[PDB]
Design an enzyme around this catalytic site. Structure first.
Site, PDB file in Angstrom:
ATOM      1  CG  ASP A   1      -5.394   8.750   1.167  1.00 59.84           C
ATOM      2  OD1 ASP A   1      -6.329   8.656   0.444  1.00 59.84           O
ATOM      3  OD2 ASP A   1      -4.464   8.543   0.295  1.00 59.84           O
TER       4      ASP A   1
ATOM      5  CG  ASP B   1       4.047  16.357   5.572  1.00 58.29           C
ATOM      6  OD1 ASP B   1       3.759  16.864   4.040  1.00 58.29           O
ATOM      7  OD2 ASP B   1       4.357  14.596   5.041  1.00 58.29           O
TER       8      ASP B   1
ATOM      9  CG  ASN C   1       0.565  12.358   4.873  1.00 57.40           C
ATOM     10  OD1 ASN C   1       0.770  11.644   4.641  1.00 57.40           O
ATOM     11  ND2 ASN C   1       1.690  13.088   5.260  1.00 57.40           N
TER      12      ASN C   1
ATOM     13  N   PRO D   1      -3.831  16.145   2.490  1.00 48.64           N
ATOM     14  CG  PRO D   1      -5.664  16.277   1.228  1.00 48.64           C
ATOM     15  CD  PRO D   1      -4.614  17.061   1.488  1.00 48.64           C
TER      16      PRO D   1
ATOM     17  CB  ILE E   1      -0.736  -0.092   1.132  1.00 47.16           C
ATOM     18  CG1 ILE E   1      -0.049   0.060   2.706  1.00 47.16           C
ATOM     19  CG2 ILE E   1      -1.763  -1.534   1.532  1.00 47.16           C
ATOM     20  CD1 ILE E   1      -0.360   0.220   3.517  1.00 47.16           C
TER      21      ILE E   1
END
Ligand SMILES: C[C@@H](OCC1CCCCC1)[C@H](NC(=O)[C@@H]1CN(C(=O)c2cncs2)CC12CN(C(=O)[C@H]1CC1(C)C)C2)C(=O)N1CCOCC1
Lengths: 270, 297
Positions: free
Chosen positions: B86, B127, B132, B130, B10
């Site tokens: 995510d 950081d 993360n 989107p 992934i």
């Protein structure tokens, strides 16, 4: 664990002062200290730790490492030894240098390379051994590598003062803490108490309580213990804030320095 | 590591590959990050050490959990809890239909709670993009990828040779500020809040100057009145074109007055006046999702 401790933090725009202070207080409840850990290593003597810590301090100056890096290495070492048994003198250099390697990797933006850590051991430690030891230390510490060091507490206290020459006062108090930390008996006292007592010796009970929140009763015993050390420092005059090439003047106070403190330690203990 | 069965790759980073893996005996699913220590010249990567330590200190429902750290032969495995998607993939999947405003509100509230917790621990994420931000199938969202996170007991400086996000980078960073602040995380969340509403990146620049002008075209060219000191910043140029701040009714049409109020405060030019994470939680936009507690003193 100090029911009489107040909160000295000023009002903060970025967060809730109460929660910020609480997290700081809870660190002392996760990161333990054991002033008698050398009893688990009968072949070791307290002077050995002082010698090892003084040498790491000199390594830090040479590479201009931060004070926090040195205190992270000291806390890593002391906590690691408390989890071990029957260690001998010939292994301390590797345990110490690997503690500094872990610390530098956590704290410095551009840490020195592993080969430089092996280099300063002068053929005593190889890079593969440091790599082996760093993993041993980190696993034994259960990867809990974020304590509030003695010197980080000084920054908290001096920041509370500033937000209410500060750099020269900082390095002078830091110099006293640098001397005290060489004596394993300092671990009897919470890191926060040690920092507040050193600051008291360069100031007053009133400023100490204002910036640290501790009442006099909480620091008196540390203050009494620290007496010989504060005195040998005061007798020689305190050092002066130095300049470092490649280090901004605004951060110079946070760079670890080194003086011949082993002779001062002897006079203090006398 | 013998009780884990790798199921799918992934991800992949500088320091390792990330796998979806299943616990053969329990059936639980985890995200495994495999660091090959044989190829690491400096031992455990500094970024890995910092992230492991930080995540052990940061336990919060809106922060991805680090479940374990396993040292096998020559390999270090970081075992994280698994979340199916995510926020970037969720927003892309919802580009046609749009995300229901109550889910947008709930997601942003949760992001602010996890962020407020980070800031309470004196840690900047730096950081928040989107990719993360991870979501599960129960309506929860958590902060992840703390590789760039740094503690601010002492000022965190900006470095020319550090790779950080551009679309979610705050204007004070672009204008050469010497230090980062908690405000850069709020700015990122503001960009993400607008992206959730419009389903298009708010400021998709392709260069540092392009990113800056894009911000100026939307919020207006800043001056000493809205942001004291702008004219003195290193990368500021009097030559900057003068654009007018657009009306937020057109920037984020689906948002109500309360939502538009929060977004403007999260996108304030002045890092000193940009809303804090704890303050954003108190904004009237979240009155239906929360209710204060009695204050002592
Ligand atoms: C105040 C200054 O210290 C004065 C020095 C201290 C040492 C001796 C001389 C004078 C300054 N530091 C900060 O403001 C730190 C860094 N902070 C950030 O970076 C932020 C990021 N986002 C939001 S705040 C917030 C900060 C962490 N903090 C607290 O926890 C508050 C609750 C405390 C009172 C303890 C305050 C500093 O270190 N400077 C050295 C270099 O340039 C000049 C200034």
């Amino acid at each position: 664990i100090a029911p009489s401790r107040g909160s000295p933090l000023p009002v903060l725009s970025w967060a809730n002062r109460e929660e910020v202070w609480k997290i700081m207080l809870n660190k002392e409840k996760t990161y333990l200290r054991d002033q008698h850990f050398l009893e688990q290593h009968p072949l070791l003597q307290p002077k050995m730790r002082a010698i090892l810590l003084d040498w790491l301090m000199e390594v830090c100056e040479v590479y201009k490492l931060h004070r926090e890096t040195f205190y992270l290495a000291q806390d890593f070492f002391d906590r690691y030894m408390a989890t071990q048994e029957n260690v001998v003198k010939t292994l301390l250099q590797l345990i110490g240098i690997s503690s500094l390697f872990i610390a530098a990797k956590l704290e410095e933006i551009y840490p020195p390379k592993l080969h430089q850590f092996a280099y300063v051991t002068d053929g005593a430690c190889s890079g593969d051994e440091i790599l082996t030891m760093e993993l041993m230390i980190m696993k034994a510490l259960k990867w809990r590598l974020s304590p509030l060091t003695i010197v980080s507490w000084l920054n908290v206290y001096m920041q509370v003062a500033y937000l209410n020459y500060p750099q020269q006062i900082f390095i002078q108090i830091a110099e006293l803490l640098d001397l005290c930390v060489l004596d394993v008996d300092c671990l009897e006292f919470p890191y926060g108490i040690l920092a507040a007592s050193a600051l008291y010796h360069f100031s007053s009970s009133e400023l100490m309580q204002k910036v640290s929140g501790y009442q006099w009763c909480d620091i008196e015993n540390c203050v009494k213990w620290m007496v010989p050390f504060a005195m040998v420092i005061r007798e020689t005059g305190s050092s002066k804030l130095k300049h470092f090439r490649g280090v901004a003047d605004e951060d110079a106070h946070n760079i670890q320095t080194h003086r011949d403190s082993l002779d001062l330690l002897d006079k203090a203990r006398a | 590591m013998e009780n884990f069965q790798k199921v799918e790759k992934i991800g992949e980073g500088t320091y390792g590959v990330v796998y979806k893996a299943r616990n053969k005996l329990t059936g639980e699913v985890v995200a495994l990050k495999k660091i090959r220590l044989d190829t690491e010249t400096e031992g455990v990567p500094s970024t890995a050490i910092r992230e492991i330590s930080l995540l052990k200190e940061l336990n919060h429902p809106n922060i991805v959990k680090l479940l374990d750290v396993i040292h096998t032969e020559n390999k270090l495995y970081l075992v994280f809890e698994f979340l199916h998607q995510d926020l970037k993939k969720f927003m892309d999947a919802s580009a046609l239909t749009g995300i229901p405003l109550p889910l947008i509100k709930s997601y942003l509230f949760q992001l602010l709670q996890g962020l407020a917790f980070c800031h309470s621990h004196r840690v900047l994420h730096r950081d928040l993009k989107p990719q993360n931000l991870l979501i599960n199938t129960e309506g929860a969202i958590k902060l992840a990828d703390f590789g760039l996170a740094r503690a601010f007991g002492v000022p965190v400086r900006t470095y020319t040779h550090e790779v950080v996000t551009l679309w979610y980078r705050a204007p004070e960073i672009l204008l050469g500020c010497k230090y980062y602040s908690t405000a850069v995380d709020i700015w990122s969340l503001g960009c993400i809040f607008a992206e959730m509403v419009t389903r298009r990146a708010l400021f998709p620049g392709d260069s540092e100057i392009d990113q800056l002008f894009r911000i100026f075209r939307t919020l207006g060219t800043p001056d000493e009145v809205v942001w004291p000191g702008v004219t003195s910043m290193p990368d500021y140029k009097p030559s900057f074109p003068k654009w007018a701040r657009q009306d937020f009714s057109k920037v984020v049409p689906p948002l109500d007055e309360d939502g538009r109020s929060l977004l403007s405060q999260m996108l304030h030019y002045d890092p000193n006046k940009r809303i804090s994470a704890k303050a954003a939680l108190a904004h009237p936009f979240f009155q239906d999702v929360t209710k204060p507690v009695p204050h002592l003193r």
